[PDB]
């Protein structure tokens, strides 16, 4: 089952 995207964090 494809994960899909997530919301980008403030820190990388």
């Amino acid at each position, epitope marked *: 089952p494809a994960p*899909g*995207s*997530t*919301a*980008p*964090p*403030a*820190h*990388g």
Partner: antibody
Amino acid sequence: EVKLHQSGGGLVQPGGFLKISCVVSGIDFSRYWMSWVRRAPGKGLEWIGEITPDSNTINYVPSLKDNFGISRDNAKNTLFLQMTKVRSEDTALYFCASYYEGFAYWGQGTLVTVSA
Amino acid sequence: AVVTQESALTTSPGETVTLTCRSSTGAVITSNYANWVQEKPDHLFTGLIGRTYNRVPGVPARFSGSLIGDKAALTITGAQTEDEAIYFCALWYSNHFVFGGGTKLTVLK
């Protein structure tokens, strides 16, 4: 549209414990990093911590990792902040926040007063 | 460890104002992922910038992020009276953010 509803604001005595909740709706909670901060008069804004969607990374500011614990339940769209052994200087308005590039979404705040 | 900002700045509507953000450990670099958060009355917090340059969706274009010398910076072009507020900076140190003391920005009303 997006609501971060916080719950559990009140009075606790020095050395007590307390758990705050923040229920998220309007976004896919399971896909957002979440964070806890606090605001007190004269103490500005202080970053407590953050937690990834899968909870496998829980980052804390070293000064507060000892007696603060961040958790989440994705099935119930809920973020939790637990505090132990609290002291007078822990009095503050605590805020849950959701990351999207920056501190994108914010809760309404939860007042915690530590007084004997 | 400690993040320092100007305590207060005053500008006029339509003018340009730049707030800075210093790290006590060294020069502020992209890996500090400077964040900028705005506090308006009634503890209304609005995320402005993340990772130095990226605007939070919905933030107007007049809020810009950059690095100036050894510091991070937020620039408001054509400041509006509604921008009168406190501006907190946050720098990332490997595994935790540290907020600065905040800058009270006055946009003369």
